[PDB]
Amino acid sequence: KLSEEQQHIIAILLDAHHKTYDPTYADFRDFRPPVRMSPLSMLPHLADLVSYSIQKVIGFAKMIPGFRDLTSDDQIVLLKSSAIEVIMLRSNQSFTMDDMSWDCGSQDYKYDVTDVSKAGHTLELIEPLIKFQVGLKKLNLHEEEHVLLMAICIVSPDRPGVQDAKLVEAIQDRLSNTLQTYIRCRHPPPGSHQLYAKMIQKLADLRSLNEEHSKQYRSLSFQPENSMKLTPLVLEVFGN
């Protein structure tokens, strides 16, 4: 059964997401304008988008039960490694299979494969990124499962640089068991079939997507002129 504590946990993560994801996308107006003409013409805009989203991912992680019990250092390593993965995850909410783009409310802020390409990335990342978005969308997760997956992604024991892996793992196990139990008690079949295992597989896909993004990011950022168009937070979090 879903204990009171597990329901409390789901309640907290739902609210935390509510406070950190604005479905109206009103803030996108603050970003440098998107240019769709020109090499890297979408980099300033998507760099801003990402920087804004890292800030939101951080606010979410702070409200993850137990996350605050970690040392400043472990909090930092967990966010540095998970940030891009949680951004790929959370972006599923704006992704649409209708035309395989991320649709943020208006044509200006609708992003497709060629936009991401004009941000300095290649199909080696972009294709499997879309396949990821598609397969995640096909799980048709409950919002409860969506926020649990993001939280589990953030508190992962095997992230590089982790110190207190025993405690990271203990916090994750609490969220994992919350998710496994939620699915059994609240996700009716056939949608529930192997759903936990499919969700964990998506966390593996995310590791692979993380690895490739980092590679294309290092190539992009190694050019001082490109790294110039990024933001200070992106340079600190993604590396410089």
């Binding site: 951080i58 702070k62 400043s72 930092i76 540095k80 600190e236």
Partner: peptide
């Protein structure tokens, strides 16, 4: 370890 902005956003 030299993450001023991450650390500030986490506090």
């Amino acid at each position: 370890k030299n993450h001023p902005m991450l650390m500030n956003l986490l506090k």
